Amino acid sequence: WTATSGSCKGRCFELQEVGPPDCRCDNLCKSYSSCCHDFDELCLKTARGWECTKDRCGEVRNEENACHCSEDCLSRGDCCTNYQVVCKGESHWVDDDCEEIKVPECPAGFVRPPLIIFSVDGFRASYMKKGSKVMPNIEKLRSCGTHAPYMRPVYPTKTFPNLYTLATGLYPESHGIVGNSMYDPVFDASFHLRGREKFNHRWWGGQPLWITATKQGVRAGTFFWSVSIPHERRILTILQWLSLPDNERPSVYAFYSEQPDFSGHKYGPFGPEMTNPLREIDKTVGQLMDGLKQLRLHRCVNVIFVGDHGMEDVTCDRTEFLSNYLTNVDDITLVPGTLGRIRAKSINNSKYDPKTIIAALTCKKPDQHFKPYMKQHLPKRLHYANNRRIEDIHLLVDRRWHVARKPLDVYKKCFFQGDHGFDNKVNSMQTVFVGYGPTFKYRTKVPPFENIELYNVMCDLLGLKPAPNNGTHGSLNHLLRTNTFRPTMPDEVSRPNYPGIMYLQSEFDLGCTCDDKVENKLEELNKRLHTKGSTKERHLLYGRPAVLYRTSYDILYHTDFESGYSEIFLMPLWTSYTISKQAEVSSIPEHLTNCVRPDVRVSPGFSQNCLAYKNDKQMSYGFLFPPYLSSSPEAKYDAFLVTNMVPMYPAFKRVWAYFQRVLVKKYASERNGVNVISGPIFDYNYDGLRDTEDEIKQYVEGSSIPVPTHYYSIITSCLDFTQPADKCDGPLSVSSFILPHRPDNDESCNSSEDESKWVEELMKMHTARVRDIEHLTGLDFYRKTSRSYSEILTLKTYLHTYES
Ligand SMILES: *[C@@H]1O[C@H](CO)[C@@H](O[C@@H]2O[C@H](CO)[C@@H](O[C@@H]3O[C@H](CO[C@H]4O[C@H](CO[C@H]5O[C@H](CO)[C@@H](O)[C@H](O)[C@@H]5O)[C@@H](O)[C@H](O[C@H]5O[C@H](CO)[C@@H](O)[C@H](O)[C@@H]5O[C@H]5O[C@H](CO)[C@@H](O)[C@H](O)[C@@H]5O)[C@@H]4O)[C@@H](O)[C@H](O[C@H]4O[C@H](CO)[C@@H](O)[C@H](O)[C@@H]4O[C@H]4O[C@H](CO)[C@@H](O)[C@H](O)[C@@H]4O)[C@@H]3O)[C@H](O)[C@H]2NC(C)=O)[C@H](O)[C@H]1NC(C)=O
Ligand SMILES: CSc1ccc(C(=O)c2c(Cl)cc(Cl)cc2Cl)cc1Cc1ccc(=O)[nH]n1
Ligand SMILES: [Ca+2]
Ligand SMILES: [Cl-]
Ligand SMILES: [K+]
Ligand SMILES: [Zn+2]
């Protein structure tokens, strides 16, 4: 109960939330059902509309009006946005040529340029070009400011998870807003777009920008707008707050639009009905820019025009029904739509079996427009596992499709022609970024980047120190005219040993055999030089990766490759090698098929052994530097060292071998040489961070050899591919992946065919950023290059998406 009988007189859109049951006049009151009796009358005036006309100029002030054309309105902070255009012969912002904003041009009392986040729901990236004719204000922002061709949302590509990511720099798995709809098993509560539950603070983790600012003495406008407050009233409230006295004025503001999303759902992303909502968004941008020009703030404020996700064509008849696949369909709860999440209908039911559910959903129809996953097997790039509100069973739905439990759910629980939510690499889910202002660059295009990076940049823009987040601070420095944040490489924590030859062969009892006793003053000196790192400049092109945690490891040099060998994990943390465009593929000689050789640099005690592999009927082994790519038959012996060996399921060995035998060589051909860094990853608790030794859940039978959950590779070349990778003067080009190390290939429905019909497809699905690899390994790459550190950070956040 609210004593809703107090008044909003004087307090319209007050910035501090008053405590109950003293009635409210802020933005959230409509939704809390707690507005004072007179809120509508005083605070949501509409009389005379939103525009000045000739006959209103120099009028006598009438307080009932929605906005004002009286002579006193500039001082009072409440003119209609077009006031000066109509009554003072001024021009609209959009009709002024753009001029570089070299320095902030702010009124006295502004301690820093304000930041305005103009946020648009469902604004697909291609609207910038396709809708350009009807969006002149937005097109001016875009061409005069800094813009990306598109911005990558987070998964799922829904509204709430993406807005809260914008505000916190965090993956949904970390901030808690894992879907537009969610069920928490501990709260026994469901969170929904509609209703009151969403307002409880227990759902909302991390630290959003308005709180970061408040805690560091920067005041903030509301980010949440009530649906029922019209857009012209949100613009006018922002411009009013901007006329408050210096001690009361916020430095950060947000404007939110439910369009074009709302129409996109009804009409599809390019329906003819979509032209008008783009015109309307444009007009709102013109209002804000006209209002800012009135207050002399249009060369002082930094504006961000940003979307939360795009919009795809999705209709009723493109629905897959779980009832066509399962028979026990009434035992599950499905969160339906452009993604699937499945859990038991009852927790008091012990019969429920995820393995049986997954099995009934895998490769059952030729055309199947979804693919089931245990959450921990989803591509690592989606970062969508480490939260109790994310169900163990996930369905990645094909773009343009929906998943539903039963047909009754679709005709009784067509209406819609668009939707979003799909994998965040899908073109049609991409969205927009433009920054315009004194702190942004002038007329600059930047590469596509992810929305998890903006929190750091908005903190920079406001002189704030960011709460810890998943952005890579520095990676967007190239957006900004003037920096504030100077990144530095993390310090190496463990330094390597460099062992020489310390062990005689007979000290090893590893149960290994090799046919290698088939053996000069010229090339006895050479192989000794190789073992001391003579070729190391060739194979380690960017310096050794730094180990950022406490551990014990050895650098091992060879003719063809270099490695960092973990004495703790009994295998390399990283193996580095260069394959030039000219290099040849050869095969494993018959006599060397089961060859594994003890490494005289590394004790028996810190080595793997062949016997464990013999005994483990599930687990075989592969090599990190491939024998196939040896530079000489003599160099090929180095690849069979026990220290180059790693545990691999035979199912996995199919993928791995195809990558090593066919794809490295193809990439080296196409890219003019490639450098490859490969290694294992341990993430048993699926938190996207490297596992400590005591977190490992699986070992090769009867040994201390831990089993990787994933295998990575980082493949680097020269962006100017007329230069060879090993002699590149300028910017680098990278693609990487993190392959799940799985004992079957159930993920790939064509896996019974030749590897050439399915392996590359899998590897594309599991494309990764270097930065994802870094979190997963505790390593830091590219420490010695000629590139600036900012550029290197951009490079480490790059994701190769394989879309067209
Ligand atoms: C993406 O970026 C983020 C942010 O950097 C990374 O996420 C961070 O990861 C850290 C390492 O895993 C993790 O550290 C934990 O945190 C434990 C403390 O937990 C609470 O406190 C957090 C701080 O809030 C305050 O922040 C500022 C200062 O920064 C203050 O001024 C304010 O006062 C703030 O309140 C808070 O963030 C955190 O929020 C989570 O939980 C909330 C409610 O439950 C949710 O609403 C919210 O969404 C967060 O939930 C996420 O994270 C949790 C795990 O924290 C996860 O389970 C969820 O699914 C979800 O993903 C909490 O409220 C701290 O106690 C931990 O310490 C243990 O381990 C260390 C190891 O060194 C030991 O030394 C230590 O003693 C302790 O061990 C003990 O406990 C063990 C397990 O409980 C037990 O086994 C053992 O025996 C011991 O008893 C540890 O430091 C951060 O909390 C986490 N932050 C967030 C927001 O997620 C993330 O990794 C990045 N992702 C990638 C891929 O890189
Ligand atoms: C830059 S606009 C922006 C940024 C972040 C957030 C939020 O984090 C948020 C909050 Cl604070 C409360 C709730 Cl219930 C849900 C969300 Cl997603 C909200 C908005 C705007 C908005 C969103 C939806 C809406 O109805 N009204 N306004
Ligand atoms: Ca982990
Ligand atoms: Cl959802
Ligand atoms: K075996
Ligand atoms: Zn939507």
Structure description:
The protein starts with 28 loop residues before the first helix and ends in a 7-residue tail after the last helix. Strands 20-21-22-25-26-27-28 form a 7-stranded antiparallel sheet. Strands 6-1-7-16-2-17 form a 6-stranded mixed sheet. Strands 10-11-13-12 form a 4-stranded antiparallel sheet, with helices on one face. It is an alpha+beta fold. The longest helix has 22 residues, at 650-671. It has a domain at 505-797: 3-Layer(aba) Sandwich (Extracellular Endonuclease, Chain A), CATH 3.40.570.10. 22% of the residues lie in helices and 16% in strands. Helix 10 packs parallel to helix 12. It has 22 helices and 29 strands. Bound molecules: a molecule of 9 linked components (NAG-NAG-BMA-MAN-MAN-MAN-MAN-MAN-...), the ligand CSc1ccc(C(=O)c2c(Cl)cc(Cl)cc2Cl)cc1Cc1ccc(=O)[nH]n1, calcium ion (CA), chloride ion, potassium ion and zinc ion. Ligand XVQ binds at residues 117, 119, 160, 163-164, 166-167, 198-199, 208, 223-225, 227, 254, 256. Zinc ion (ZN) is lined by residues 122, 159, 261, 265, 420.
